[PDB]
Amino acid sequence: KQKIGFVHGIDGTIATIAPAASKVTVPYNTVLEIAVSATNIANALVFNLEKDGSIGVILLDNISEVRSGQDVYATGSLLKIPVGFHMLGKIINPLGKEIPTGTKLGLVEEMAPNIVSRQPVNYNLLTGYKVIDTLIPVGRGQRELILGDRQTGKTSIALSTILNQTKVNNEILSKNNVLSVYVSIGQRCSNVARIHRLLTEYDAMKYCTIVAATAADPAGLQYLAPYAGTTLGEEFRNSGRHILLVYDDLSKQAVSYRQISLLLRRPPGREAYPGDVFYLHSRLLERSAMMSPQKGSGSLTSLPIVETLSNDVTAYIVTNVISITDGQIYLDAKLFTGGQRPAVNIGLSVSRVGSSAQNKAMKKVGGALKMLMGEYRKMAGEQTSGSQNVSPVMIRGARCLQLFNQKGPSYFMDAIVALYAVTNGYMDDVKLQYSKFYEFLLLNKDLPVLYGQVNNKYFYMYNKNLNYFIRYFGLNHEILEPELKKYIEIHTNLFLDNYQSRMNELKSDEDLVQLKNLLYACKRTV
Amino acid sequence: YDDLSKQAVSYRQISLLLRRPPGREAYPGDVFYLHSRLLERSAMMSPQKGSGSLTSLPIVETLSNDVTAYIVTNVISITDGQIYLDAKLFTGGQRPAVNIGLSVSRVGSSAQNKAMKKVGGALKMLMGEYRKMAGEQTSG
Amino acid sequence: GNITGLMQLADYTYNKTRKELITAELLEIIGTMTAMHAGKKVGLKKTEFW
Amino acid sequence: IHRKAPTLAEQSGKDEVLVTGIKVIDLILPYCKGGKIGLFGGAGVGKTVIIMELINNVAKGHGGYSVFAGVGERTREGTDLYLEMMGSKVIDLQGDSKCVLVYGQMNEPPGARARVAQTALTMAEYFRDEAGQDVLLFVDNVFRFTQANSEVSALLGRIPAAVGYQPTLAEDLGMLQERITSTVKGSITSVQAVYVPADDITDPAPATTFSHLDATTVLSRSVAEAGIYPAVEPLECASRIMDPDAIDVN
Amino acid sequence: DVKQVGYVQQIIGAVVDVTFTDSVPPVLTALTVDAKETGTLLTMEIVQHLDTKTARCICMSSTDMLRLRTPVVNTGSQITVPVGEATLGRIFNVMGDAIDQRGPVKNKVRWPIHRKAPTLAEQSGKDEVLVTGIKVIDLILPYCKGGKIGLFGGAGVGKTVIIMELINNVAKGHGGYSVFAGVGERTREGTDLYLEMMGSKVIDLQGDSKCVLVYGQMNEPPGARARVAQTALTMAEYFRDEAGQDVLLFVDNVFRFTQANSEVSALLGRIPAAVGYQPTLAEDLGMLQERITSTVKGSITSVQAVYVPADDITDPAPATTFSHLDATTVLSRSVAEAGIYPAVEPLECASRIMDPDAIDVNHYNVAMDIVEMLTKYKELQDIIAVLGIDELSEEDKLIVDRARKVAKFMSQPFAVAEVFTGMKGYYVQLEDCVSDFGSLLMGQCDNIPEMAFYMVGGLDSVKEKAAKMAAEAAAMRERARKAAEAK
Amino acid sequence: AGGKRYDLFGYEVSVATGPFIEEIKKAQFYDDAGEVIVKMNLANTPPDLQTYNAVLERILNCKSKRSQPVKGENKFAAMMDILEEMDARSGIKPNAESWGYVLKELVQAGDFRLGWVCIAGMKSLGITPDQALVDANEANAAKAKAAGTDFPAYLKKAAPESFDTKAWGI
Ligand SMILES: Nc1ncnc2c1ncn2[C@@H]1O[C@H](COP(=O)(O)OP(=O)(O)OP(=O)(O)O)[C@@H](O)[C@H]1O
Ligand SMILES: Nc1ncnc2c1ncn2[C@@H]1O[C@H](COP(=O)(O)OP(=O)(O)O)[C@@H](O)[C@H]1O
Ligand SMILES: COCCOCCOCCOc1ccc(C(C)(C)CC(C)(C)C)cc1
Ligand SMILES: [Mg+2]
C-alpha cells in the first residue's frame, strides 16, 4: 500500500485531504481507504480536486473515528459492489455488507444503453391493482413515478407490486421472471424491519432484495443506495432477466446530494440544489431500459417514489422527475381519506405506454374503462350531492370504483372477469354496498358449482391456470365468450336471489355491524 | 427604444457576472439611474440653446396585462405619459389596441392644435360616457 | 364569467408570489455565499519576481 | 453522551396498543407501546397541554421510568411541570421517584439547546438497556433542537440550504431519530412535539420528521379556533399501527 | 508546425481547468484527451479564461478516472462536426461521433459548430411562405420560411405523425432535407421514433433518407445537451448554404434546452437571476435563434416544442421563446378524441405572417372569415347546449352547417400513416385549397353532406367520395327493395 | 436454406440455431434450456419455432425445474409463457407439433377442463387434435365425474347462512 496524502479537515460526513510531498496523481471518482486505526478502515470517495493541491472526499463509514493527521491510502479504482444471483435472499448495505437480523464486482456508475441496445416495450408488469393494470398500465422497462403526500399508499403500492410476483415467478420459467430490488433511502430502520418480516412472512424475498441506507447512515451512502440497486439490476439486464427497482425515496437522496454539494462548496441553485441534480437523477433513471434481442432481451423497470407537500407539483424535483419518467401515478389525500384506496387521480396520472404493454384481453377492457370513466367524470362532476342518477355510466363507474378499492394485490384472472361484468352491465342490479361481497362469491366461492348449475364444460373460477388462455386467446374469442356470459349470468341470478334478498332483511343492530365488517373484510382479502 | 426591458436584461447579465448585489426582480438597483441617464437626455431645449428637441418613444413589454411590473413602473416614473395596448382588444379585433383609460398624455394638451384640441375634448367626454354606459348595463 | 375573471388574477398573483419567494430564497443563499467568500482570506502568492 | 444507533438486529417492533384515556387518540391514532409519537403544531394549539395530560395519564400507571426533555421550552411551563409532578408525588425525594427532568430552555445557548435531547437519551437508554425497564421519553420540542443547529451552521461556515436551515439537517435529525427506538432489551414509548412555523407543512423539518415517526398527531388553528380541543384534524393525521390486524376490526 | 498541449489542474464535476505554457486558445476551443485514460474518448470546450495560462473547460462526457496533470491536446479549433449527403439517415452526437452503430460516415468536409449568424446583407427581409401541403397549417398558420414555430402537444395527439408528414412534404415539395434535435429526449421515445422513421421510410437505409438525427439524451451532461441544437444547426446550415435549399429543424423541448443552459451556468458559478434560469438566458437563446433565419441562399425554418411549467406563460423562458417565435401549432386531445387529425385548434392558435402586406389578399380574407365563422360557431354551440338548435334562426343554422363542414374538412389523411391505416394521403396545393375554402364560404358547394368532408383533401377529391357514398346508399336501397320484394 | 432475418433496426440476424437445439435437448432440467435462449439472444442468433418446440419438449420430458424442488412449480404456465413470448413479443405462432406437447401435458396432469380448452383452440385455429389424446381427456373427465373429482369439495360445501367473517373464513 502506498498513500497519497493525509487528512486535513472534516465537516461531519465530508472530509478533505492534503497530498504528500511525493505528488502523485489521483483520479476523480476513485475509492480512498483511510486508516483510522490499525485494523478498522474508513472507506471513502474522491469528489473534487483543486489547483493548489487538495481533495474533497465523501466518507462512507466510520465517520466518528476520523481524526486529523491520519494516513490516507488510495485504490486507483472506481467504487464497485458484489454482484450476482447470490444476493437475492439477503438484506444489504450499499457497500455490499450483509446486514444481520434478529466472485464478481460491478460498478456503481455505468453508462446507460443507447437506443440501439434497447427495444420498444411490449410486455406488461402486473402490479395486481385493477387501477394501475387497466388505465395506466406498467410495462417492463417502463420507469413510472409515484407521487403523493405522506401516508397515502406509495410504499404499499410499490410493495404489493412485489408481492404479486411471488405466485407467478414460481410457476413460470426463471428467464421471464421479473425479480425486484427495493431501495430505502433515509427510511426508519423499523420500517425496514417490518418490510423484512412481511416479505419473509409471504416468501416474497426469494425474488426481492433490499438496499438499505437509513437515516443514521452517511449522506454518501444515501447518495449511493440507488446506484447500488441499479448495479444489481444491470447484471439481470445483461443476463436477459427481468428486474424491478423501487426507490423510497429520491427526495431524501436529493437532500443528501444538497448536503454534500453545499458542504463541498459547490454552487447552489433552485431550492438550494446544484444545477446537475436533474442530471443526477438522469444518471439513474435512464439506466432503466427494455434491452434488445441482441442484448438478452432483459429489462429493468423503475418505480421511483417522490413525496409531495400540500399536493405541490410545481416543485423543482417533482417537475424534473415528471420530465424524466415515462408516465406517473399521483395519489391524493383527499381521496385516501374518502375511502378511495389506492387514492389515484386518473387525470393527472398518465401512461404514455398506452396499449403496447397491455395484453389482447386487456386492450378492450381498459379502453372500455377509459370510455366509461371519461364520461363518469363529466356526469359525476355536474350532479349534485343528493341527486339520484340511474344511468349505466354512473352505475358502472361507481361499481368499478368499488372494485378498484382493495387492500393488497389481485390475481389477473380475478382482475379481468370482475371488470368485464361491469363494462358489459352484469354488475348493475347489485347494490353499491355489496359489490366486494359479490366479487368474493364470484372469485373464491362458486355459486353455480354449489347450487348445481354445472352447464359449463371448462369455465370455472377455481383452477387459476385459465388466465394463461385468457392472455393468449382473449375473452372476446368465440369459445370463451358464451361460457363466460353463462357463468356470469348464473352467478348474478343466484346472488340476486339468495343473498341480496337476505341482506336487506337484516334490520337489526348487531347484524348490520357484522355485515359492515363482512364487507370491509371482503375488501381486504379480495 | 425596442426595448428597455432587454436593455435591463443585458445590464443584469453584466451585473450578475460581476456579482453585484441584486434586488427586486433580480435587478441590481441602479437600473433606475440606468434609464434616467437615457431618458433625461430627451428634452425640449430652450431658446437660449436653439429650441431643438429630442422626443423619445420607448417600448416596454408587459406580462399578462400587468402594469405593476417593476420595470414598467420605474419607466412610468420617468416618462411624460403612457400609451397602453391591450392584448384583450388586439385579440378582440381592435387595432391599435389602445386603452384610453390606462393611457394619458400629461403635457400634450399645450401642443395639441385647437382644431384637434376641441375634437379631442368632445371625444374624451364621449368616451368617458361610453365607458360607463357600456359597463353599467352588463347585458342586462 | 366573473369567477373566471377572478381565477385568472388569483393564479397570476399566486405564480407571482411563488416566483418572488423563489428569487428571494435564491438571493438569500447568494448573499450568504458572498459573505462567506468575503470571510475567507486571500493567500500569499510568493514567487520569484526578479 | 453520543453513542451509535441500535443495529437492525438489536431493534424490535412489537405491535402493542397504549391506552391514553383521550378520545381522539383512542380511535384515530391508537398509540403503540414502544413506538414514536409526534405532536405537530404551531404556537398556541395545545401540544404541551397534550404532553402534560399524557404524562398525567400514562406515567402514573407506568411501572417503568420516564424522562422529560425541555428543549427551548418556556421556563414557566418547566416550573409548572416540576410543581405538578411534585404535587402528584411522581417526584418523591424522601421516597422514590421515577422521572428524570432535563432542561435546556430558551435562555440557554444553541450548543446546549442542541445537546439536551442527547442528554435525555443518555438517561433513557440506561433504563432501557441495563435496567431492562420500559421508558417514557417526552420531548418538548424537536424544532428548537433543529433551529439551535441552524443558528450555528452559518457561524461554522456551512452554506445554508433552502428556507434558512442547516445543510446537515436531515442527517442531524436522523442521528437522533434512529437512537430513539425500542430494542430487544426494553421499549421507549417516545413522544415528541414539533413547531410548524406559520402553519406551513411544506417546511422541510416537518417534511423530514414525518417519515421518522409512527403516530403523526397533528393540530390545527382551524379546529382550535372553533372551540374544539384537542384541536386534532383526523383527516390530516394518520398513524402507522392503524392496521386491520394490529387493532380490532370493528 | 506542431500542436498545443496542456495539463489538467483541477476537476469539479463537468468543469475542468487546464494549465498551458503558451498563449491560451480562444473560447469554445476543443481540447481532447485520449481514450486510454478515461476508458472512452473525452472532449472539453474552453469557456472561461482565469489567467494568462489557465483555461476553464466544460466537459461533454464523463470525466471519471481522469487523473491529474494528464496531457490534453488542443484541436486547433472548435468542435468540427460532419456535414453532407453522408450525414443523412444517421445519428450523431455533439462531437459528430455516430452512435447508431451503422458503421462510419463517409464525409468530405467537416465544418465547425459555432458558426456566426448571417449578416444583415445576407439576410432577406422579404417574408415568404412555405407551402406545407397541409391545408390546416396553410390556411390559418402559414409557415414562414426562415421562421420559428412553437408546437404544443403532449402524448397521443399525433405529434410524431405531424412532424413526419412535415418532413415528407418539405422533402418532396421543396426538395429540401430536414433535421431533428432531441435535447434531453427520453431514450424510449428515441427508440419509438427511430423505428417509426424506418417503418415510414423517411429514413430508407437501403435508399434515400430525408432527415438528419441528433440525439442528446438525458444521460448526457448539460455541456452536451446545451450544444446539441448547435450541432443540428451546423448540420442544417450546410444544406441551407451549400445545397441552396429549404430545411426544417425540429427541436425537442426548448424548456429542456433552457434547463441545460441553466445547469451549465450553474456549474460555471453564474448567479441565477430569476426562478433558477441562467442570467444569460436571452443571450444564449438569441445566439441560437439569430442563426435560424432566411437568406438569399436558402432557408432554415425551426419547429420547437415548448414545455410550459405550471401552465404559466409569464415565465421568462417561455416569454423569451415567444419573443422569437412566429407561429403556434397548438394541439388538443378533444378534437383528437373527436376524430379530427391533424388535431389543430385554429382559434387558440395564432401566427405572425397573417397580413396581406406579407401574403396575398384572398388567403387572408378567407382565413379571417373562417376564424369569424368558427368563433360564431363556438358561440352558437354554447347556445345550443343551453337552448337547442331549434331555437336558432334559419341564418344561424346555415353557418353552423358550414362551420361543421369546415371542421370536418380539416380532417386530413397522411402519407406517413398510409401503410398503418390504409387510406391514401393527399398533398394539396395552396391556391387549390384557397379556392376550395372560398367555394365552401361562398356557399357554392353546400349540397355536399357533412361526413363526406371527413378525412379527405381537396374539393376535387372529396367529390369522388361523395359519389361513392351516394352509389353505396343507392346500392343498399336497391338491395333492400329487392330483398323485400322477393319475399 | 434458411431465409434472411433482420433485427428491428435492420441489422442482419443469424439463422444457424442448430447446435443450440442439441444444447437444449441435453438439458437435464427444463430451466437450463431456458438459460440457453439467453446465450442465443446475446449471440445475435435468436430461437426459431423448432427451438421453442425443443424447449417445450424438454419442459414436458424433464422431471423438475431445478435440482432441488420448488414450491408452486408448474409446467403448464411455463409452456404458456413461452407461447405468449413466441406470439406477442416475437410474432411467431405455434403449430400442431406444439399444441401436441401442450395437450399431452394437460392429459398427464389430468386437467381435463384446460384440455377441452386446448381442443377448442386447436379447433378454432384449424388444427386436428389427436383422437388418442381426445379419448384420454374424455376418459379422465368421465373418471373424475364418477369419483367426484369433477369439482373440489370446498366448493360443494354448503355456504354459511350467517354473514360472519369467521363463518366465511376470510
Ligand atoms: N388499499 C388500502 N386499504 C386499506 N388501507 C391501506 C390501503 N393502502 C394503504 N393503506 C394504509 O395506508 C397506511 C400507509 O401506507 P404507506 O406506508 O404505503 O403510505 P406512504 O405514503 O408510503 O407512507 P410514508 O409517507 O410514511 O412513506 C398503511 O397503514 C396501510 O395500511
Ligand atoms: N379545552 C380547552 N379549553 C380552552 N382552552 C384550551 C383547551 N385546551 C387547550 N386550551 C388552550 O391552549 C393554550 C395554548 O397552550 P400551549 O400548550 O402553550 O400551546 P403549545 O403547546 O402549542 O405552545 C392554553 O392557553 C389553553 O387555553
Ligand atoms: C398578429 O401576430 C401575432 C404573432 O404572434 C406570434 C407569437 O404568439 C405568441 C403565442 O402566445 C400564446 C398565448 C397563449 C398561449 C396559451 C394560453 C394558449 C398557452 C397555455 C394553455 C399552455 C398556457 C400560448 C401562447
Ligand atoms: Mg411508505
Ligand SMILES: [Mg+2]
Ligand atoms: Mg406548548
